[PDB]
Design a protein around this ligand. Sequence first.
Ligand SMILES: C[C@H](CCC(=O)O)[C@H]1CC[C@H]2[C@@H]3[C@H](O)C[C@@H]4C[C@H](O)CC[C@]4(C)[C@H]3C[C@H](O)[C@]12C
Ligand SMILES: C[C@H](CCC(=O)O)[C@H]1CC[C@H]2[C@@H]3[C@H](O)C[C@@H]4C[C@H](O)CC[C@]4(C)[C@H]3C[C@H](O)[C@]12C
Ligand SMILES: C[C@H](CCC(=O)O)[C@H]1CC[C@H]2[C@@H]3[C@H](O)C[C@@H]4C[C@H](O)CC[C@]4(C)[C@H]3C[C@H](O)[C@]12C
Ligand SMILES: C[C@H](CCC(=O)O)[C@H]1CC[C@H]2[C@@H]3[C@H](O)C[C@@H]4C[C@H](O)CC[C@]4(C)[C@H]3C[C@H](O)[C@]12C
Ligand SMILES: C[C@H](CCC(=O)O)[C@H]1CC[C@H]2[C@@H]3[C@H](O)C[C@@H]4C[C@H](O)CC[C@]4(C)[C@H]3C[C@H](O)[C@]12C
Ligand code: FES
Ligand code: FES
Lengths: 359, 359
Amino acid sequence: RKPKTGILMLNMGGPETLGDVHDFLLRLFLDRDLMTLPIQNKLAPFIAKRRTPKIQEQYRRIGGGSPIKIWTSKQGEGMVKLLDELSPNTAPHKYYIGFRYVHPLTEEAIEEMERDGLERAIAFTQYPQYSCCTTGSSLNAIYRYYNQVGRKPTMKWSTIDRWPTHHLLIQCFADHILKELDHFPLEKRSEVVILFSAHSLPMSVVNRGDPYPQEVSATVQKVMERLEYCNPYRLVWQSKVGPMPWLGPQTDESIKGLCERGRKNILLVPIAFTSDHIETLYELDIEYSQVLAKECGVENIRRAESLNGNPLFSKALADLVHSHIQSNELCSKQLTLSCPLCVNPVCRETKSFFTSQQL
Amino acid sequence: RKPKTGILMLNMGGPETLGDVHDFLLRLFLDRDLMTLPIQNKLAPFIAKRRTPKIQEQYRRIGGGSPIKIWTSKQGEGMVKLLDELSPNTAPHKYYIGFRYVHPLTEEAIEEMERDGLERAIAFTQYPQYSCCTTGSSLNAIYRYYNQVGRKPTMKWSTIDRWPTHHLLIQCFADHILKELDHFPLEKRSEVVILFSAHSLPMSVVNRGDPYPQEVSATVQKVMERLEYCNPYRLVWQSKVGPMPWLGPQTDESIKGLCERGRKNILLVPIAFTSDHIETLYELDIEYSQVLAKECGVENIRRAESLNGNPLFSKALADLVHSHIQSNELCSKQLTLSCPLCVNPVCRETKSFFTSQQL
Ligand SMILES: C[C@H](CCC(=O)O)[C@H]1CC[C@H]2[C@@H]3[C@H](O)C[C@@H]4C[C@H](O)CC[C@]4(C)[C@H]3C[C@H](O)[C@]12C
Ligand SMILES: C[C@H](CCC(=O)O)[C@H]1CC[C@H]2[C@@H]3[C@H](O)C[C@@H]4C[C@H](O)CC[C@]4(C)[C@H]3C[C@H](O)[C@]12C
Ligand SMILES: C[C@H](CCC(=O)O)[C@H]1CC[C@H]2[C@@H]3[C@H](O)C[C@@H]4C[C@H](O)CC[C@]4(C)[C@H]3C[C@H](O)[C@]12C
Ligand SMILES: C[C@H](CCC(=O)O)[C@H]1CC[C@H]2[C@@H]3[C@H](O)C[C@@H]4C[C@H](O)CC[C@]4(C)[C@H]3C[C@H](O)[C@]12C
Ligand SMILES: C[C@H](CCC(=O)O)[C@H]1CC[C@H]2[C@@H]3[C@H](O)C[C@@H]4C[C@H](O)CC[C@]4(C)[C@H]3C[C@H](O)[C@]12C
Ligand code: FES
Ligand code: FES
C-alpha cells in the first residue's frame, strides 16, 4: 500500500560516529536561533574545528557515537505498528526521523515525506516538555523549509508540540523508577534520595518566558504522585557550559552537596528525554556517578534506565498520535502563545504556519 | 469544653495598620534565616527606619493596612466548624495564628496553645508550596521557641508542610479563574492570556535546592488541567528587589512584553498565596494593572479573586487537617530531605524536631 499518514519524529540528534562530530558542531554554531556570533560564518567553522577533539573524545568514552537514532528507530517501528491498527481509516502510517543537526535532517525528511505523496503530516516532537531551544527550533525548521523551497506544503500538517503529563509517559517513568529501587540494597531503599535531572537553560532564556522549566516540573509531580511519594525527591539541572548564569541547582553540585550532608544513596532520574544519549551515558554515568561520586560518598548512585525499548513507551507514542488525529487539533493551545519576551521574528511565523493549516 | 486539637495557621503576616510597619520590618531584618547583615543588630533597626515611609505609603494606597489577618480568621473559623463534625474523636478544635513578623507571633501562639493543655498541635503552613524562606522559616520558629526555653512540648506535634496540589485547592483556583473570565468582553475570552504570578526567589536560593519553583509549577499544571487548557498560560514571578538576580520572567516585564506583542487581554492569577495582601492589592492591581499597562496597550487586564472567604477553601483546609490527622503522618516525605546545598545548620534541627515527635 501507498503510505497515507507520516509521523515526523523530531529531536536535536547526536553524532552517530566520531566522524560526524565536526559537522554536528558546525550546524549548531551556524543556527542563528541559538546563537548570534560575530562574523558567525567564519567563527562557526573555526569554533567547530577547535571543539571537535573534546567532543569526539566524549563519544569515545561511550562507545564511539550516539545511540539516539537507533532508539528513535525502534520507537518509530513500534508506534507505526500500533497505529495501522488503532486507526485503520488513517491507512498505512510511516514514521520519519528529522534531526535538527545531524542526518537525516529535518529538511531531508520533509523532502522525502513530500515525494511519498502523503496526505497528512504530523510534526511529533520527542521532547515531552517544550523549550524554544528544542521543539521550537525543530518547528522553525519546518516553517523555514517551506519558506526557502518557496512552495507550499503538498500535504496536510499539524503538530504535537508538547506532552509533559501523558499518562503512559508517566507510567514508563514510574515503572522504570521502581525497578531501579529494587536494585538498591533493601537496607538502603527508604533512605534513597531521588534527583530528577534535566538539561539546564541559560537564565536569559528562562527569563524570556520559556515554558520548559514549568513543564518539566509538571512531569516530576505527576510521576511522584503515581509513586505515592515513597522517597524524597528534588529536581536539578545538568549540562551547563560557559561563564553565564543558568538555572540551578546543577546536578553535579547537587550530588556532591547531598554526599557532604549524609545523603549517600542517590537515584538519578533523567526526566526530560526518552532515550539514552550523551547526557546519560557520558555526563551522569561517567562524569558524575563514577568520577565525582567517588571522592564523595561512595555509597550508592544508580540511574533509572532510559525508556529506550520499553514496549509501553511505544504504546504511549501511538496513543498520542492517535488521540491527536481523533481531535483534529493543529497544535497545543500553548503554541498559540509565543513567550512574552520573544526577540525572534520567526516564532510568530512558525506558530502561524501551524495554526493556519488547511483542514 | 476543653479544646483538644490545636491547628497552628502559619503565615509571614503583614502590617495591620501604618503604625505596624516599622516593627514589621525590624523583626524581618533581624531574622538570620533570611539575612546575614554585618553588625545585624545595629544595621537592622536602621534599615527599618530607613524603609518605613515608602512601605507605609504602599499600605496607604490600599486602605492603610494588611487584610491578611481578617481572612486568616475567617478561614480558621470555617475550618474549625467543619472539623468538629468530620473528626469528632479529635474533640473540640481550636485554630491559632502564628505570624512570623507581626502579632500574633509564632512564639506568642505556641504559648497560648500550651496554656490550653491541648493534647494535639498541628503546624499548618498557609503556603501551599514549600519554600525554605516561607514555610521553612515558620517551622524554624517552632523549633527555636522550644530550644530557647529549655523545655519540651507538653503537647503532641506534627506538620502539614505543603499541599501544592490538594484537589480542592485546585478547584477553588479554577472556579475563581472561570468566574473571572466571564467578566471579560465575551468577544475577547478565547483571546485571554493567563499569567499565573508568584512571589519570586533570588537565584542564590533557587540554586541551592529550594523546592519552591517546582511545586508552584505543579499547582499551575493541575489548575490548567481542571480548566481543560481553555486559554494559553505562562508562569511568571513578582516582587524582585535589589540588584541581585532573581528567578524570572518578572511579572511586570511579562505584562509589558505581551502588550508589545499584540496580546492585550490578560488575566493575572496569583497562585502561591490564598488571600489578599500587598502583592495583590498593591503590586498587581496598582503598580501593574493601573499605572503600568495603562501606559502600554490598554485593552483589559484583570486579576482573579483571592480565595479569601470562599467556603470551598474552608473545606480544603479541614479536608487537609482531617486527612493528616487520620494518616497519622508527622510531616511530608519531602521535609525529610533538606536542600542539597543548604548552609543553615537549623534546617537539620527543625527537620528532626518533626520527624522525631513521640507517635
Ligand atoms: C555541544 C556543546 C558543548 C560545548 C563544548 O564543546 O564544550 C553544547 C554547548 C551549548 C549546547 C546547546 C545549549 O545547551 C542549548 C540547547 C539545549 C538542548 O537541550 C539541546 C540543544 C542545545 C542547542 C545545545 C546543543 C549543544 O549540546 C551545545 C552547543
Ligand atoms: C547564545 C547562547 C544564549 C542564547 C540567548 O542569549 O538567548 C549562549 C549561552 C551559552 C553559550 C555557549 C557557551 O558559552 C560555550 C561555548 C563557548 C564558545 O566560545 C562559543 C560556543 C558556546 C557553545 C556558546 C555559544 C552560545 O554563546 C551559548 C549557547
Ligand atoms: C524573597 C524574600 C525571601 C527572603 C529570602 O529568600 O532569603 C522576601 C520574604 C520577605 C520579603 C520582604 C517583605 O515581603 C517586606 C518588604 C517588601 C518590599 O516590597 C521589599 C522589601 C521587603 C523587606 C521584602 C524583601 C524580600 O522580598 C523578602 C525578604
Ligand atoms: C553586602 C550586603 C549583602 C549581603 C550579601 O548578599 O552578601 C549588602 C546588602 C544590604 C546592604 C546594606 C543596606 O542596603 C542598607 C545600607 C544602604 C546603603 O546604600 C549602603 C550601606 C548599607 C548599610 C548597606 C551595606 C551593604 O551594601 C549591604 C549590607
Ligand atoms: C535596605 C535595602 C534597601 C535600601 C533602601 O531602600 O533605602 C533592602 C531592600 C532590598 C534588600 C535586599 C534584597 O532582599 C536582596 C538581598 C537578598 C536577601 O533578601 C537578603 C539580603 C539582600 C541584600 C536584601 C537586604 C536588604 O533588606 C535590602 C538591600
Ligand atoms: S523565544 Fe519562545 S516564542 Fe520566540
Ligand atoms: S535552605 Fe532549604 S533546607 Fe536549609
